Amino acid sequence: EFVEIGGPSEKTFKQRRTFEQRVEDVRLIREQHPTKIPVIIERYKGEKQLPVLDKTKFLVPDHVNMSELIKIIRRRLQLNANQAFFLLVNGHSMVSVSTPISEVYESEKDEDGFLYMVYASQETF
Structure with a gap:
């Protein structure tokens, strides 16, 4: 009784902006806001x-820190407590990171200068 409309596939941020565009975005944002970490959350x-x-x-x-960031993203997604949520950076879960995001940036940032995060309802695929 519902009909699926097929739809174009979901494009990622790296698909939407070229590497050189991403690199310039970060170069500018780091000069203008040296205390802010540029993060892509998908x-x-x-x-x-x-x-x-x-x-x-x-x-x-x-x-x-990561525990704070998890809380912010769950709030932005308007999740209830029954809903699981995992935040992954480069193939590993950010739940138990102790450090500020400053240190995650330093360890994990992409070549382009963004820190990429992916969320999911499971930790491993």
């Missing part, structure tokens, strides 16, 4: 439980 490509986030490109104050 839903895992095969995710079927969690909704899509309203935006993609974030500036996160450098002292914010």
